């Protein structure tokens, strides 16, 4: 395997781990994260 | 024209309205929003 995780690399199974980790943030922290994500997708392209 | 600055100081106010609207979403919906932003910033740039 690729590491401690049993899942294959580069597959869309990262989305379940992203929802798993996102739920752990406080209300201010999830807002700071989503804002930091939003400004990146605006400055790209 | 020159690339600097990437934007003027004007119209930074979208960020405060983005925080204001992000706080209104349910636990599942704020994660769907952040995931929709994440897959875009991974495909872009």
Number of independent structural domains in chain A: 1
Q: Does residue B23 sit within a domain? A: yes
Residues on chain B touching A15 (C-beta within 8 angstroms): 35, 39
Q: Contact, B23 vs A31, CB < 8 A?
A: yes
Residue A37 CB neighbours (<10 A): 18
Q: Which of A45, A24, A2 is nearest to B44 (CA)?
A: A45
User: Distance of CA A45 to CAs A9, A14, A37, A41, B43, Å?
Assistant: 26, 24, 14, 8, 10
Q: Is residue A26 part of a domain?
A: yes
How many H helices and E strands in chain B?
A: 2, 0
Q: Given an 8 Å threshold on Cβ–Cβ distance, is B37 in contact with A35?
A: no
Nearest to B22 among A15, A34, A43 (CB): A34
Cβ neighbours of residue A37 under 8 Å, at least 6 residues apart? B34, B37, B38, B41
The dihedral sign for the CA sequence A4, A33, B3, B45: positive
> What range defines the domain where residue B26 resides?
14-43
Classify residue B21: in a domain, yes or no.
Answer: yes
- Determine, for residues B34 and A15 on separate chains, whether the beta-carbon distance falls below 8 Å: no
> Does the residue A2 lie in any domain?
no
CB-based contact B30 A34, cutoff 8 Å? yes
Q: Is residue B8 part of a domain?
A: no
Cβ-Cβ contacts under 8 Å for B27 (sequence gap 6 or more): A23
A9 part of a folded domain: no
């Amino acid at each position: 395997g690729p590491g401690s995780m049993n899942k294959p690399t580069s597959s869309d199974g990262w989305k379940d781990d992203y929802l798993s980790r996102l739920s752990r943030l406080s209300k201010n922290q999830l807002m700071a994260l989503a804002l930091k994500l939003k400004q990146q997708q605006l400055e790209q392209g």
